[PDB]
Design a protein around this ligand. Structure first.
Ligand code: HEM
Ligand code: HEM
Ligand code: J11
Ligand code: J11
Ligand code: H4B
Ligand code: H4B
Ligand code: ZN
Lengths: 402, 403
């Protein structure tokens, strides 16, 4: 059991929760691979299913009861005959919150118990997927007052193709490759933009064109659906003191909704299970707008600020980055859309660690992802040691469908 | 593909494989069950370590398999066979010291690894001589502000005999005085060593920036106290380029970062006292030393001077003050003509180092959480670079405090 120290305060805990991990990560005693973004039978499903049902009845303080025993028998009966089984809705709700709770790269986990779960397992077409996706967006957005949500489409089955959302997020901006090899719009979405085009989309030519959805029912070609512009809440970016900033024409969408991850609960796998909460300002202000392989606006802003771009030592990059993050915070706050800054978020994450220590004896956490991309050591999480491991229920990466 | 870790740069889309990790002979704290990467601290044996190091040396001069290589090997085992230890040739020490710096996963300054002035102090026999050696190191390394990387190597651990030790964690640190109030005047990181200095007869000051004396230990003796002559300790008064009041804060830092309590291991030999130094990266002073809550903690003071709204997180008052403090550090060192490197130039040059080592050794052990600077992380190229972390020898290691 690893000793875990906070270096700001000198306090120590022991992670005992990590002993519950059944799935290996990428590190060995010879070498740490913790900085890598991606990872390089009835008997098995049955034991994962049992473990998960044990978790569910333990959660509701009914561990060992009749309802518990008879549910374990239902699952056993179903697997033995069909090679698979099905979750009850309450179990799925428990499973979804648990997967979020268990996500080591998520800093917003203090919110984990507050999650609206939409059961969409009765979906038989891409068209119906779209309807469900539209309700989710309407619900989650809630006129700027964002509410965390997940919609769960039908689980994977051995004899057939997956339900999939091809887009990585429900709302994302197009990336158009230009003749001069440069990208107009968001360079992270060139490929998906190109797919939307080969499947019949009439593309715009702006910097912030909301992409259509490519939704796929089993063993069918994906289908194209345009989101009604009134469902996609956006925030124009202005700066509190710098009046020229708004003339940059910059904007971002309100709703961060991840749509291409796989949700695993009790050995069952949900290949389409889009989920959303609200932004932490550094995601937009630092990563989306300042990454050199994204909108890459740092120099433009610095020049507008009349900073000296000749040399690194003037810290023109740091200065511009702070104003961009400020603009995001201010703009969202002006537009009455839920946003959280990296100080507020990391402070609440520290509380989460304390809560989880008492409740479960630990919390899986990925330090490199929890610590924000500006002002790292200015946040309490920088000084907190963390233990990273895989618990189930879990969110996972899966291959792109194309 | 290749059965070696695949390493991706996400800014550029480039891929490499680390083959160098195969050479690792020591385990870190990670397992397949759990990653512990964020933890700050996690005769037959000697001979195999020695043989490996000697093989390393002869490969580095391209004489692997040669008569001289096999003779040295035979010479090493004969020394161990009769004495339980062996000794390094002068040039072997030089190579091993540079290699230990090259191998250090947490150092971003490694582009400079081949430019290291190695002082051989393996003749040192008293605390007074240790002092002389250290003063010469400080004088050479400081070079009136044109800093030069250096290491001074004192005698190795002997069986049955006591260690040479510098009790201080650095050759230059500021005192931390615990107050009746409960608070600390000076550097709170240095409370214990300050209190040890007073116990061993140092008459303390009562300032925020009092240079500590050295507590130096020759084998099997109590440590002796030595005051550095102040003309040897170059310091930089901090001022800001445009914020005129910053100078009035009376902030300052010393020029020479010199780690003094680390163990240098080479071929199984352990050098308990081998202090080394380079020059600062500006974030070390401006962000950590000055803005950590458990250090000088000046963020609020500076933000108040800048008239920021310190009552709400979303004003980004902390981010704004930190940037200016960091700029003040850079500006002040540049004005004073003291070598310093900003976090952008340092990480850019570290990326070049990664490419050099890919070609030369097939990888570079690097600790991502330490390589990425404490401000402006994703603004530097290293944030977007995946890294493989593992232990290679020769190495620098932490060692227990002597008291
Ligand atoms: C409620 C507000 C939330 C905030 C402020 C938040 C914040 C974040 C941040 C900053 C990251 C790091 C990802 C990055 O920067 O690229 C992250 C990752 C993640 N979040 Fe949260 N999150 C929230 C809600 C949720 C919800 C509702 C779920 C699912 C039910 C969730 C699941 C995840 C998962 C699985 C990851 C890891 C994805 C990956 O490995 O890229 N989060 N979150
Ligand atoms: C030449 C200029 C140098 C720069 C800019 C530099 C920079 C750094 C930085 C930023 C760190 C991270 C440590 C922290 O933030 O606490 C570090 C660690 C380290 N450096 Fe370098 N360094 C330099 C020279 C050297 C030299 C000459 C050596 C030894 C020969 C060395 C060996 C190490 C070691 C062993 C560590 C990890 C131990 C620790 O501090 O925890 N460095 N360095
Ligand atoms: C639900 C929720 C709320 C908030 N605020 N935030 C989040 C994280 C997502 C949004 N903002 C970034 C992050 N996830 C998007 C990218 N992450 C996958 C990394 C990856 C993997 C493979 C290939 C790639 F190109 C990239 C989720
Ligand atoms: C040679 C050289 C040049 C430069 N620029 N920089 C350096 C690193 C030192 C200077 N600035 C901090 C760092 N040395 C910090 C001490 N080691 C790790 C932290 C630690 C470990 C154990 C207990 C603790 F309380 C703290 C060396
Ligand atoms: C290579 C490195 O692991 C990668 O750039 C990670 C680092 N930390 C991160 N942290 C968060 N929150 N989001 C990210 O996309 C990343 N990227
Ligand atoms: C808890 C965490 O491991 C610790 O605070 C580390 C993080 N990264 C660091 N990186 C550097 N360069 N120096 C440090 O002291 C630290 N501290
Ligand atoms: Zn690891």
């Amino acid at each position: 059991f690893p000793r875990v120290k906070n270096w700001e305060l000198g306090s120590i805990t022991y992670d005992t929760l990590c002993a519950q991990s059944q799935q290996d990560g990428p590190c060995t005693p010879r070498r740490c691979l913790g900085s890598l973004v991606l990872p390089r039978p009835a008997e098995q499903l049955l034991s994962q299913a049992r473990d998960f049902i044990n978790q569910y009845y333990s959660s509701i303080k009914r561990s060992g009861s009749q309802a518990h025993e008879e549910r374990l028998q239902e699952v056993e009966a179903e697997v033995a005959s069909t090679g698979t089984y099905h979750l009850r809705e309450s179990e799925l709700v428990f499973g979804a919150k648990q997967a979020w709770r268990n996500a080591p790269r998520c800093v917003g986990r203090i919110q984990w118990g507050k999650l609206q779960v939409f059961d969409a397992r009765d979906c038989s077409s891409a068209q119906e997927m779209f309807t469900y996706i539209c309700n989710h967006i309407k619900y989650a957005t809630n006129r700027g007052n964002l509410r965390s949500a997940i919609t769960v489409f039908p689980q994977r089955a051995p004899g057939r193709g997956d339900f999939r959302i091809w887009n990585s997020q429900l709302v994302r901006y197009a990336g158009y490759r230009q003749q001069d090899g440069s990208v107009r719009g968001d360079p992270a979405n060139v490929e998906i933009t190109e797919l939307c085009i080969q499947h019949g989309w009439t593309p715009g030519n702006g910097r912030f064109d909301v992409l259509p959805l490519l939704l796929q029912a089993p063993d069918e070609a994906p289908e194209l659906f345009v989101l009604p512009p009134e469902l996609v809440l956006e925030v124009p970016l202005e700066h509190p003191t710098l009046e020229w900033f708004a003339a940059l024409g910059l904007r971002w969408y309100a709703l961060p909704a991840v749509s291409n991850m796989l949700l695993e609960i009790g050995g069952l796998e949900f290949s389409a299970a889009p989920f959303s909460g609200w932004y932490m300002s550094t995601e937009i202000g630092t990563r989306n707008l300042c990454d050199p392989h994204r909108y890459n606006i740092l120099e433009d802003v610095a020049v507008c600020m009349d900073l000296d771009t000749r040399t690194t030592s003037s810290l023109w990059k740091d200065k511009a980055a702070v104003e961009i993050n400020l603009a995001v915070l201010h703009s969202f706050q002006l537009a009455k859309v839920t946003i959280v800054d990296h100080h507020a978020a990391t402070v609440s994450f520290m509380k989460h660690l304390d809560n989880e220590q008492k409740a479960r004896g630990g919390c899986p956490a990925d330090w490199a992802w929890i610590v924000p991309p500006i002002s790292g050591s200015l946040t309490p999480v920088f000084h907190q040691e963390m233990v990273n491991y895989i618990l189930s229920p879990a969110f996972r990466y899966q291959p792109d469908p194309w």
